[PDB]
Every structure is written in structure tokens, then in C-alpha cells.
Amino acid sequence: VKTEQEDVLAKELEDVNKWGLHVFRIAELSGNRPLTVIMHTIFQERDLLKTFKIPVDTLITYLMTLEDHYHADVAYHNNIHAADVVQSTHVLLSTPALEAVFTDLEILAAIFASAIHDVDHPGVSNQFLINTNSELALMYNDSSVLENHHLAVGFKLLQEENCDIFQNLTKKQRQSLRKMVIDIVLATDMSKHMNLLADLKTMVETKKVTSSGVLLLDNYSDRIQVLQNMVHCADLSNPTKPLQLYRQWTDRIMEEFFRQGDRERERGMEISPMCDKHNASVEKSQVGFIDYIVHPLWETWADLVHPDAQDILDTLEDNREWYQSTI
Numbered sequence: 062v063k064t065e066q067e068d069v070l071a072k073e074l075e076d077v078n079k080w081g082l083h084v085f086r087i088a089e090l091s092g093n094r095p096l097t098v099i100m101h102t103i104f105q106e107r108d109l110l111k112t113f114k115i116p117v118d119t120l121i122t123y124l125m126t127l128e129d130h131y132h133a134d135v136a137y138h139n140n141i142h143a144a145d146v147v148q149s150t151h152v153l154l155s156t157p158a159l160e161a162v163f164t165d166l167e168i169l170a171a172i173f174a175s176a177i178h179d180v181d182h183p184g185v186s187n188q189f190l191i192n193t194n195s196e197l198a199l200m201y202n203d204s205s206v207l208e209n210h211h212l213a214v215g216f217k218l219l220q221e222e223n224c225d226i227f228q229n230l231t232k233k234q235r236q237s238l239r240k241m242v243i244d245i246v247l248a249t250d251m252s253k254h255m256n257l258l259a260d261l262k263t264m265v266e267t268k269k270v271t272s273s274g275v276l277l278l279d280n281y282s283d284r285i286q287v288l289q290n291m292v293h294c295a296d297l298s299n300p301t302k303p304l305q306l307y308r309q310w311t312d313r314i315m316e317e318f319f320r321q322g323d324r325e326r327e328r329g330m331e332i333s334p335m336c337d338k339h340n341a342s343v344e345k346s347q348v349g350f351i352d353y354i355v356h357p358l359w360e361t362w363a364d365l366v367h368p369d370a371q372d373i374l375d376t377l378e379d380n381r382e383w384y385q386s387t388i
């Protein structure tokens with residue numbers, strides 16, 4: 062029998078299958094363990110432990126280890142953000158239009174990639190790491206610096222004591238899982254955005270459907286690019302969440318950006334675009350960002366899974382008009 066706090070946490074976790082879970086409340090209730098508890102809930106919810114023979118304590122140990130490698134003093138790019146994207150991907154996976162499409166392995170990869178996609182994020186951008194001549198930048202030859210590091214770290218952690226949650230997968234399963242996870246995480250790099258969206262639009266144009274309205278994806282290219290856009294959507298899903306959640310996310314990312322702005326000035330690096338704490342229209346940046354990136358993307362997704370994303374798209378448009386007022 063759980064403590065009262067655990068019971069309250071548990072009643073919150075009953076919303077796991079719903080857009081708008083109050084992830085910040087879960088983070089509070091769980092003693093800053095939103096990623097661990099949300100992942101554990103999803104894995105049990107999707108029967109992943111049985112299917113892949115994952116020992117539960119190995120799962121817990123890894124999860125806790127993973128979460129510990131997110132930075133608590135990073136305003137946005139932290140374990141709470143990881144948890145959010147995990148659960149969001151989780152919801153997108155359950156969309157009616159994609160029912161019975163993806164194998165258990167592919168689901169496992171989409172969720173695991175979500176969990177690790179930002180681990181050990183230092184709270185500054187690729188360009189900042191490149192311009193400071195940082196070790197990380199030189200390791201990854203300035204290309205997808207953070208994203209390569211997230212992957213390397215997330216896999217490496219499997220080697221810590223009692224952390225290998227994939228210890229029972231066959232070599233075939235592990236090689237396939239790993240490639241999918243790598244393709245998914247590298248695609249979270251925003252510099253890949255336009256091309257990702259190009260492929261997504263192209264697939265909407267050529268969209269096919271079989272037996273009860275469910276999408277058809279008959280080659281790795283198509284299947285992986287869908288999962289890639291799905292996680293990228295989860296990663297840019299803040300403006301589609303209830304305004305209460307969206308506003309908290311905006312505060313956090315702007316706090317992070319201004320911190321980077323401060324660090325840039327403390328050294329006379331050119332103050333990044335809209336990273337200047339003194340001259341910034343948060344409201345205006347959010348609208349432009351929605352019009353130019355978030356809405357085109359979500360609208361395209363909505364077409365792929367029509368009409369499943371209708372409410373998410375409505376919410377995004379509502380939050381867009383709201384921020385517009387604010388100006």
C-alpha cells in the first residue's frame with residue numbers, strides 16, 4: 062500500500078494516454094522523477110517488459126540513471142521535457158489512423174528515442190558549442206553536436222551496473238532497434254526540420270490506406286520517416302498543449318535562451334537571435350515560430366492522420382490567437 066503522495070501521483074498518471082497530462086505536477090509529486098515514472102507507466106501500459114523480457118529493476122535502474130544525466134539546472138532541456146516528449150510520442154503512437162501499423166520493436170524505438178533524445182543537454186545550442194570551440198563540437202565535427210551526444214550518452218548508460226534493459230533482445234532486434242533510435246534522434250536536430258517536413262508533405266500527397274482507414278507504410282524509408290516526424294512533432298508539441306502548459310514551457314525555453322544570451326555577452330559573442338533578455342518580444346517570437354514552423358508541421362501531420370489531430374490543431378490555433386492578443 063502506497064504512501065498518500067504516491068497515491069496522488071498515481072491518480073495523475075491515469076491521464077497518461079491523454080494530451081495535456083500535467084507533467085509538471087507529476088514531476089513535483091514524483092520527487093523530480095517525471096521521466097522514470099512516466100516511462101515505467103508507459104512500458105507496463107504497453108506490456109513492453111513482457112514482450113522484450115526486461116527485468117523491472119533493470120528498467121528502473123536504467124531509467125533513474127538516464128534521468129540523473131539530465132541537468133536539473135537547465136530550465137527547459139531537462140528530464141521534465143524528456144518525460145513530456147515520451148508521453149506525447151506515446152499519445153501520437155495510439156492515434157486511430159496508425160493503429161496496427163508499427164511493430165512492438167518500432168514502438169519501443171520511438172519511445173526509447175524520446176526518452177534519451179536530450180540527455181545531458183548543457184542548456185546551450187549547437188552553434189554556441191561550435192563557436193566556443195568546445196570539446197563536444199570537435200568530437201562531432203560541428204555536425205548535429207548535441208544530438209550525436211544525446212545518442213552516445215543514452216546508449217553508453219546501458220553499460221552501467223544493472224542498466225542493460227535490452228539484455229534479452231536478439232542481435233537482430235538490437236541492431237534494428239539501435240538504427241531506428243539513431244535515425245529518430247538525429248532527426249530532432251532542428252536544422253533537419255524543412256527536409257523532414259518536405260518528406261512528410263510528399264507522403265501526405267502519396268498517402269495510401271488499407272482495410273479500415275489505417276495508413277500503409279511498406280518500406281523502411283516510409284516507416285522510419287513517419288516515426289521521425291512523430292517524435293519531432295512531440296518535440297514541438299508545447300504550443301499544442303493547454304495554454305497553462307504551453308505558457309510554462311515558453312517561460313522555461315526563454316529562461317534557457319536568455320541564460321545563453323547572458324553567457325554569450327559575458328564574452329562578447331554576438332547575442333543570438335531572440336536570445337537577448339533586454340530586447341525580445343516573447344509573444345511575437347512565439348507567433349512567428351508557430352506560423353513558420355509549428356503550424357506548417359502540425360497541419361501536415363494532421364493531414365496524415367486526418368481527422369485524428371483535429372483537436373490538437375484547434376488548440377494550436379487557439380493558443381496562436383492568444384499570444385497574438387498579448388502583443
Ligand SMILES: CCNC(=O)N1CCc2c(sc(NC(=O)Cc3cccs3)c2C(=O)OC2CCCC2)C1
Pocket residue numbers: 251296297298299300310311314334335346347350354
Ligand atoms: C528557425 C528554426 N529553429 C530556431 O529558430 N530555434 C530557435 C528558436 C526555437 C528553437 S526550438 C524552439 N521551441 C521548442 O523546441 C519547443 C517550444 C515551442 C514553443 C514553445 S516551447 C524555439 C522557440 O520556441 O523559440 C522562440 C521562438 C523564436 C525565438 C524564441 C530552435
Ligand SMILES: [Zn+2]
Pocket residue numbers: 178179207249250
Ligand atoms: Zn534536442
Ligand SMILES: [Zn+2]
Pocket residue numbers: 142146178179249296
Ligand atoms: Zn527536445
